[PDB]
Amino acid sequence: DVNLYGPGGPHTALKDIANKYSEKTGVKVNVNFGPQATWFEKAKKDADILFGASDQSALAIASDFGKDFNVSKIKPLYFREAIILTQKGNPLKIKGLKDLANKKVRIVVPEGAGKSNTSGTGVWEDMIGRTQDIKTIQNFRNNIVAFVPNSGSARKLFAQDQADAWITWIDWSKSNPDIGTAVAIEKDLVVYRTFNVIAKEGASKETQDFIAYLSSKEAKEIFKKYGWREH
Amino acid sequence: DVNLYGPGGPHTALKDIANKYSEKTGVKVNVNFGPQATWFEKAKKDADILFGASDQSALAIASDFGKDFNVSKIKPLYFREAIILTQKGNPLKIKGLKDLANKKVRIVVPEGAGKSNTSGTGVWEDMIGRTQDIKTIQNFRNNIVAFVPNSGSARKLFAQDQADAWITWIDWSKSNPDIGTAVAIEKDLVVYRTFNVIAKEGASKETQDFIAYLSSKEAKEIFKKYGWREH
Numbered sequence: 175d176v177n178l179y180g181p182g183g184p185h186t187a188l189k190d191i192a193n194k195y196s197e198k199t200g201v202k203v204n205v206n207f208g209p210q211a212t213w214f215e216k217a218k219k220d221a222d223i224l225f226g227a228s229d230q231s232a233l234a235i236a237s238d239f240g241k242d243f244n245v246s247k248i249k250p251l252y253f254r255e256a257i258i259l260t261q262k263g264n265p266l267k268i269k270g271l272k273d274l275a276n277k278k279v280r281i282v283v284p285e286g287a288g289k290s291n292t293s294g295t296g297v298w299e300d301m302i303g304r305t306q307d308i309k310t311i312q313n314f315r316n317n318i319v320a321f322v323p324n325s326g327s328a329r330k331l332f333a334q335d336q337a338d339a340w341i342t343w344i345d346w347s348k349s350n351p352d353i354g355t356a357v358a359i360e361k362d363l364v365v366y367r368t369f370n371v372i373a374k375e376g377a378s379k380e381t382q383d384f385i386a387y388l389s390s391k392e393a394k395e396i397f398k399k400y401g402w403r404e405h
Numbered sequence: 406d407v408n409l410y411g412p413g414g415p416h417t418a419l420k421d422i423a424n425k426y427s428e429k430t431g432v433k434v435n436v437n438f439g440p441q442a443t444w445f446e447k448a449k450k451d452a453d454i455l456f457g458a459s460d461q462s463a464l465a466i467a468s469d470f471g472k473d474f475n476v477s478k479i480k481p482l483y484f485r486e487a488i489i490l491t492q493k494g495n496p497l498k499i500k501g502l503k504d505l506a507n508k509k510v511r512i513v514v515p516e517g518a519g520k521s522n523t524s525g526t527g528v529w530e531d532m533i534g535r536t537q538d539i540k541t542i543q544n545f546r547n548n549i550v551a552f553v554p555n556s557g558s559a560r561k562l563f564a565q566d567q568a569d570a571w572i573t574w575i576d577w578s579k580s581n582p583d584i585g586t587a588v589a590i591e592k593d594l595v596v597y598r599t600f601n602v603i604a605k606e607g608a609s610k611e612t613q614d615f616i617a618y619l620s621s622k623e624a625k626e627i628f629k630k631y632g633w634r635e636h
């Protein structure tokens with residue numbers, strides 16, 4: 175088998191891609207996903223590829239594997255925009271990040287806090303910081319009700335109606351259309367983060383072949399469906 | 406005494422401010438600075454205030470202190486822009502971030518890798534990602550010769566002529582006019598990160614008083630000299 179490990183998020187596109195690849199080639203490709211702690215020990219034994227939902231988080235995770243992976247070999251392949259996910263129907267009429275700072279709303283953001291490797295780390299401050307207004311930054315931060323360890327944790331909190339807004343990625347909405355209503359972030363504030371892959375040292379030909387497939391016309395189309403861009 | 410702990414960088418402004426404050430009020434204020442590992446054990450016992458050079462890093466650091474600190478009380482007070490520091494004279498004629506992607510250059514950037522709490526984490530990808538061009542992101546990344554655990558480490562590497570460009574903050578340049586040549590980052594790409602403070606639970610009046618002083622006219626002006634802004 176070709177075994178991939180990485181965070182929830184890119185996993186939906188990857189599962190579709192792996193399925194199509196397996197149908198075509200006969201090579202069994204397994205997409206393991208979730209918080210790092212849930213698969214780390216098994217991945218140490220059989221990981222062929224580590225995929226990431228951002229560069230900083232991918233660097234962190236790959237580093238944890240020691241000499242089994244050479245972190246210089248992380249390959250960015252696609253990117254997607256951050257979004258604001260509101261409760262279905264957007265009851266508070268949220269219109270962007272500045273609006274979030276101005277209104278009395280509960281925001282949930284994933285932040286690693288140096289003890290979790292999550293695509294979210296640094297995102298909210300980099301976006302709202304581009305307003306170049308300390309009051310706005312303060313107000314926004316004052317509305318954050320929870321800094322959670324990963325996107326999965328934010329999803330759970332959000333689904334339990336404990337937050338009005340979740341700072342996340344377009345793909346989370348594309349993968350879960352019914353869970354909330356996506357609101358686009360100001361183009362002058364938004365950040366775009368990448369999907370990446372890294373093959374283990376001594377990766378098999380089959381593993382390398384699948385990596386190549388991630389750049390095929392067929393894979394690009396699947397990625398596009400989930401909001402991942404090049405372009 | 407009032408004891409502060411945090412990263413190098415904001416320390417230059419804080420030193421000037423503390424000096425002025427102590428002379429004026431007679432209250433002694435100590436500014437301890439550097440990589441978290443160098444002062445963590447001591448801070449555990451007498452840190453009155455933790456200051457930060459970004460939100461994600463400050464959240465990380467404060468979270469390491471258990472109930473002694475409440476992370477919901479982190480207060481952003483100023484911000485400043487990321488810059489490119491080139492070797493003296495800017496011999497490669499670097500004009501911005503896109504230039505660092507298109508030219509053959511050696512870049513150093515601080516990235517925590519989930520094991521160091523540094524202001525740099527997520528910065529480079531958030532800036533270059535705003536080009537919305539995967540080739541550009543790839544090209545920029547390919548030029549990164551070193552990810553380092555903190556700004557101080559980048560400074561050392563830069564000083565040894567090991568890199569052509571260091572992704573850093575304006576305050577590092579202002580604090581060290583002798584080191585390199587600052588190049589402004591494209592307005593549509595640049596990120597701004599914050600200086601912040603959090604007082605320990607049960608903070609003394611002296612501690613509260615100094616926190617207030619950080620927002621005084623005299624404090625604002627000193628921060629301004631080092632590139633720290635409010636609006």
Ligand SMILES: C[C@@H](OP(=O)(O)O)C(=O)O
Nearest residue numbers: 181182208293324325326
């Ligand atoms: C790891 C996490 O995704 P991230 O927090 O990296 O977006 C997840 O949802 O499994």
Ligand SMILES: C[C@@H](OP(=O)(O)O)C(=O)O
Nearest residue numbers: 412413523524555556557
């Ligand atoms: C901690 C580090 O600063 P940072 O890496 O947070 O910019 C330093 O140089 O002391």
